[PDB]
Curated annotation (Swiss-Prot):
<dbReference type="InterPro" id="IPR019799">
    <property type="entry name" value="Glyco_hydro_22_CS"/>
</dbReference>
<feature type="disulfide bond">
    <location>
        <begin position="30"/>
        <end position="116"/>
    </location>
</feature>
<dbReference type="GO" id="GO:0070062">
    <property type="term" value="C:extracellular exosome"/>
</dbReference>
<feature type="domain" description="C-type lysozyme">
    <location>
        <begin position="1"/>
        <end position="130"/>
    </location>
</feature>
<dbReference type="GO" id="GO:0003796">
    <property type="term" value="F:lysozyme activity"/>
</dbReference>
<feature type="disulfide bond">
    <location>
        <begin position="65"/>
        <end position="81"/>
    </location>
</feature>
<dbReference type="GO" id="GO:0005576">
    <property type="term" value="C:extracellular region"/>
</dbReference>
<keyword id="KW-0034">Amyloid</keyword>
<dbReference type="GO" id="GO:0006954">
    <property type="term" value="P:inflammatory response"/>
</dbReference>
<dbReference type="GO" id="GO:0050830">
    <property type="term" value="P:defense response to Gram-positive bacterium"/>
</dbReference>
<dbReference type="GO" id="GO:1904724">
    <property type="term" value="C:tertiary granule lumen"/>
</dbReference>
<dbReference type="GO" id="GO:0019730">
    <property type="term" value="P:antimicrobial humoral response"/>
</dbReference>
<dbReference type="GO" id="GO:0042742">
    <property type="term" value="P:defense response to bacterium"/>
</dbReference>
<dbReference type="InterPro" id="IPR000974">
    <property type="entry name" value="Glyco_hydro_22_lys"/>
</dbReference>
<dbReference type="GO" id="GO:0042802">
    <property type="term" value="F:identical protein binding"/>
</dbReference>
<dbReference type="GO" id="GO:0035580">
    <property type="term" value="C:specific granule lumen"/>
</dbReference>
<dbReference type="InterPro" id="IPR023346">
    <property type="entry name" value="Lysozyme-like_dom_sf"/>
</dbReference>
Length: 130
């Protein structure tokens, strides 16, 4: 599923993402936008280390979800990576919260540093009623 901007903003608020571990809703929106374009079935294979990023938040198979084919893998979120390709984002949100629970926080996603950090991110949630 490809979410419309405001539709996603309201869904994330309802799922308790606004201000989670100090991360504003606008920051999660900025992340989803650059990671997947708000698409839940987006997948990205990293030929370099043989890992794959899954779903709306592009969660990596080496540490956060299990897909069986990633070398030297672990499963901190303890989820099947398949769960992160559903139209229902409940599981992807629970995984994203686990990632943010690590010391790096939102900085765990390099994309956030390149496209969101130290920028005006209000644009991602303006007009959405959140």
């Amino acid at each position: 599923k490809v979410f419309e901007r405001c539709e996603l903003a309201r869904t994330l608020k309802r799922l308790g993402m606004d201000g989670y571990r100090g991360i504003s809703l606008a920051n999660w929106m900025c992340l989803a936008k650059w990671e997947s374009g708000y698409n839940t079935r987006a997948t990205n294979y990293n030929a370099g280390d043989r890992s794959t990023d899954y779903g709306i938040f592009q969660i990596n198979s080496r540490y956060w979800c299990n897909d069986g084919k990633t070398p030297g893998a672990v499963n901190a979120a303890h989820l099947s990576c398949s769960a992160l390709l559903q139209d229902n984002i409940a599981d992807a949100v629970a995984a994203a919260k686990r990632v943010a629970r690590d010391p790096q926080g939102i900085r765990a996603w390099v994309a956030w540093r390149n496209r969101c950090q130290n920028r005006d991110v209000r644009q991602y949630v303006q007009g959405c009623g959140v």
